[PDB]
Symmetry: D2
Subunit: 386 residues, 4 copies
């Protein structure tokens, strides 16, 4: 039951199952994983593919020789398993050089280095088959108000993203970029803190069609925001290039729980939306098996990610397929929401006395929305109580 | 000391000093204010102007005759005082008809009525001199996931804003629109929940140049976001058409405290930014004198709004004018942030060995940002301790 | 399926289904309910009982004559239905006189009036069968730091609660008091903001055995706290006299959604705890049918409260009864948690070399907690996926 | 100006200025500090004393020989400088063995080891002069609901604290214990999450007089709580044995900014309260110089902690000493708050017709609290604008 297969397009970062358990207040609880072993164990679990930071796959400061050997080993594991690599990203946050940012570090030479580090890994990503290249500006921001001129920082952020878009255009690459928003941590406030801010920023770039968002469940929830709503707006803009799935219990540090944990009802409505809208990108899990777990718990946690997606997928499908739910949706006028407000046009609206002068405001106010009955049908399906 | 004058461009909504003190758990503590008295008392305090909802100025359901009388009284008060009306807005939230929204109500006839209600008040706003027309979609959203198809809702929201833009274009009006974001309350989640989401949505409108944001201090803070950062991004996009100033203590219900209360340091950095960037729009206070206050406390609270702006203005000016602060800004490389990252171009960057192969990553990592010394200079100025 | 009966001990406040829908930004969407009709409709739904504020049952400012008539009507409805009244409370928040508090108002005469208002309703509560009298100090607090000396306020709060305890002792009443904590709203910060603060305060009262807590799901979640954990600590202290069940989506205004909505997984673990610990008090729903709903939606929402409790009750029971879950609990050493740490005593511990000098810290560190596998068993049961 | 001296009782943890800058997403940006150098540099800055975890002073796993040498070096630095050690604590969180807790780990042998680790360091603390021994149960809690039986966990927590109290009683030590609450991080939820929960738990211990709280500014703010209010309640209970001062910007990860940053107005009201109540314990800074800083920034940040306390101390003193503020406090009836509500007694209250039957509720409701004018006087003083 609920066994994942590659058609489900489930993917995992090397850094997820490979997280050793170091947190602000504690040392590693698990040994480091060989990327080759992760590719194999994930393939056995039914995953579609893997993702990586440059520094997950090639240890930082590697010579050309060692770099080659790490990449060759990895590609062989991908060949043995048929695992794909739909997305890759740059580590612009771990090394102390990035303590004030990469693309928006106050130090100009760091910003140039950030771009060269990213461009090198774009080449490798394209070679391995990645269709999306993710930017998470985890270090772009400040802890204090005077440390960062944010208009200048956004100048530098636009400049970097424009340069990356000129680079892929000059190479004839098909890869597109996806910004992964996060409101805070490790910086006190991070630039482009939500899906909305990232989408707005993209529209000021030179080639906006090359850039979308990679929203993460837990990150929008760290701002108390409704993650299905933000995904809906990303889909509405045509910008949902990729997505990070995990769990988060409210407004606190970034938990990265396995998907399904945290806000379970939001996970249900998210899966309902992704499936209904026909999202066809990777279902990527950016999660961390809690450091309480040994290696067997790591793989159980990763399996649980896919399992919870597939259960929720079945619950939302049954919900939508239920005639009683279809009738409830009509009773709540979800169908009227889809009708143009005034396709008859502005002048017809202005002359339409039934829209104002003769609008019976009180009869319309008295019509109950029947939202609670519909939500309890949704709850009944989610819990299997139908 | 710190006495406001009309050149300071301080404005107040009729609904602010006129808030009677009804909250979810209690009845009104103050009698209703005559708009004419508010215009006069505000003018005596040194305010530049007033704003209004349609239903603040004309009681809902007013005949043409009574409407005329309410407007004539109001204009006379504006003539006696020289008070301006730089902004107006529509009440699309109080009446029970709007319980599921205005522009995005599931009921199509409510959406049409919403638009006719707004268009009527745009005409009056333009007549009274308003340069900005604000939309706060306080009822646009949901408490439960199935109640609102958010992609369809954004269709309807775009349709309404496009119709309003066609209307002002057809009338030859100069007025522009500003979306006021709010993440939640009174709906469980509100559509376009932050400055970022509103800015992104604007770029999908037919005439994006007609639309900006009216961000509110407390609303971005209800999402835990950095309000000066969001204002910076609005300024960066050229979209800061208007601004709502008040106070908010963290993530909870919308407090609307007088400006300066709540997050005092954020208020300092906000005033520093507005003044430094040369923002020239109204400094509008969307606040509520707490219901603990009688009428004398109402006017003291409103005076306190302007007073705190002017103190903070002086502190930020002294901060920026301090040679020790100018030197600290250089020590933190705020000037390098303003320099293009790679004006020499992509190819020069790719061939620049000092940007990667020969970049001494560790020497750069060892350079301290000196952010704490700069922030303590900012703290010293804010507190008058220099 | 999942039909509630009076043995389930489900109770509702008159103010819950009777909420007319007035919120900070909107007028009532529903007509007022006759308390007699609420008693009957709730009895038909399978509820065990009702609760009330004094001013829900007798309109404020009622003469003795009218008061008598309102009470007689109500008791007759209770006689016709067999509905019980296990809890009552005082409205010390709606009337403008309480704008700075009841028991801790700065004005001494208001504090005395608060106590007389409460004592009058204790008499009625005792007559109607109430075993618990709830205090919600919704107005006790401040919006600004200088407005309330909090040590003096706690003096006054202790004085009032001591006086109430002397009153019930002098009358020979069996009724006990329960403090309902709330962190904020309508005050900027409310005194005794969480279960913990309320429990600590009780231990300074003259007769601590007369006082417990009435924790509310949404209120602890408004502080981002774990509601099952706080309930566990209340049970551990022997102080869970009563409980308020509802839903809340994170840190924002007090939503009072129907129970089961909001944090669904927390609702599961709460029901699991209440049932496992053998809590036998009322399962009281302090919720508000959203103002989008008409009267049919009001009763559907109230039914949904009980329904979700009973589904979750069945899921947690099946979870606990599962042999695979019992084995998982042993694998995670939940049984070792129940064993005394050092029943051999301090001196034996000090001389036990296996507890320090010879403790193999690394072998113990390597033992995985197997928490993820256990939680995925819990998730499987909650969703019906076993 | 604002130069700290030892009479100000400012203290710092070795782990504060000694924080190397490793965070969840990045490596250390600073070399490790020798505790002897920290003692000296802090003494030069005007600090009163230092605190430590066992593992800050003696590296984990040290032989008796090396342990002795580390302690001797440290005591010599304390002798050269006259620096005191008013508080010490145990590291029960860094080592992987504590991944599920110390005192409440599910594994019984870990709980015993936790206690032996703590008891060893109590001996050293007492020797060095510590009057308070702090327990921060950072690992006590869970990420998932089934992992921790919280009633059993509180049993184990009581058992451990009782054993520690029996140990100090058996040794004739004067040292007292202080629980440092934290709501979350590194566990998803931490047991005893706030000051209130810790105070309540203490009252169930065998010897409650031996236990108080060590509240931290940022930790209560991570729950959105009012830190001055919680301190007031701790003072009211007689339990403010110690205090941790720092800065935090709202509900997010534990920032540990230098004191004064974060919520500046809350810092003002906190200093006002501590000074007014005559708190005489250490003013301890549990903060982390941001990892953006080099060693010079570390000492500037630490100096800034004391500096901001002393500025705020002067502002609050001037506020309280202002005749205009004294008059405002009377206008807001802060003096009436201090008067007993009903020292005439219950029966006199019951027979007092002026407290109910003849209480003019509307005249009392119409009396404005004048809170805004008082708060603007407080704001004026804080900003130096008087
Ligand atoms: O850079 C991309 C990735 O970096 C990871 O280390 C972070 O945990 C993620 O937020 C992000 O998806
Ligand atoms: O509609 C515009 C205005 O409506 C007011 O009632 C709300 O309080 C504000 O958020 C908003 O500025
Ligand atoms: O006074 C007791 C009750 O008052 C109600 O109006 C509030 O909504 C509840 O928080 C509380 O249970
Ligand atoms: O154990 C006591 C101390 O441990 C430190 O590592 C934590 O940062 C503090 O929260 C605490 O004061
Ligand atoms: Mg991610
Ligand atoms: Mg506003
Ligand atoms: Mg309640
Ligand atoms: Mg601490
Ligand atoms: Mn994350
Ligand atoms: Mn607001
Ligand atoms: Mn509530
Ligand atoms: Mn901390």
């Amino acid at each position: 039951n609920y066994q994942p297969t590659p058609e489900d397009r489930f993917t995992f970062g090397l850094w997820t199952v490979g997280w050793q358990g170091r947190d602000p207040f504690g040392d590693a609880t698990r040994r480091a994983l060989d990327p080759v072993e992760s590719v194999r164990r994930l393939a056995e679990l039914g995953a579609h593919g893997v993702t990586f930071h440059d520094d997950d796959l090639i240890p930082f400061g590697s010579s050309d020789s060692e770099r080659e050997e790490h990449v060759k080993r990895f590609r062989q594991a991908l060949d043995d398993t048929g695992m794909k690599v739909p997305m890759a990203t740059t580590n612009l946050f771990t090394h102390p050089v990035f303590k004030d940012g990469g693309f928006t570090a106050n130090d100009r030479d760091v910003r140039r280095y950030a771009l060269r580090k990213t461009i090198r890994n774009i080449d490798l990503a394209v070679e391995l088959g990645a269709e999306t290249y993710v930017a998470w500006g985890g270090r772009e921001g400040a802890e204090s108000g005077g440390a960062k001129d944010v208009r200048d920082a956004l100048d530098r952020m636009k400049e970097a993203f424009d340069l990356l878009g000129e680079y892929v255009t000059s190479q004839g690459y098909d890869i597109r970029f996806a910004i992964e928003p996060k409101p805070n941590e490790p910086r006190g406030d991070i630039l482009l803190p939500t899906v909305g801010h990232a989408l707005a920023f993209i529209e000021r770039l030179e080639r906006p069609e090359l850039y979308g968002v990679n929203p993460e469940v837990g990150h929008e929830q760290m701002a108390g925001l409704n993650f299905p709503h933000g995904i809906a707006q990303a889909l509405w803009a045509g910008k949902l290039f990729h997505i990070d799935l995990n769990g988060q219990n409210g407004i606190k540090y970034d938990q990265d729980l396995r998907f399904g944990a945290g806000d379970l009802r939001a996970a249900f409505w998210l899966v309902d939306l992704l499936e209904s809208a026909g999202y066809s990108g990777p279902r990527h899990f950016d999660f961390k098996p809690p450091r309480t777990e040994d290696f067997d718990g790591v793989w159980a946690s990763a399996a649980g990610c896919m399992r919870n997606y597939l259960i929720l997928k079945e619950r939302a499908a049954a919900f939508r397929a239920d005639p009683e739910v279809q009738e409830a949706l009509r009773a709540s006028r979800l169908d009227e929401l889809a009708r143009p407000t005034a396709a008859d046009g502005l002048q017809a609206l202005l002359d339409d006395r039934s829209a104002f002068e003769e609008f019976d405001v009180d009869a319309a106010a008295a019509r109950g929305m029947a939202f609670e009955r519909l939500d309890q049908l949704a709850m009944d399906h989610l819990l299997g109580a139908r």
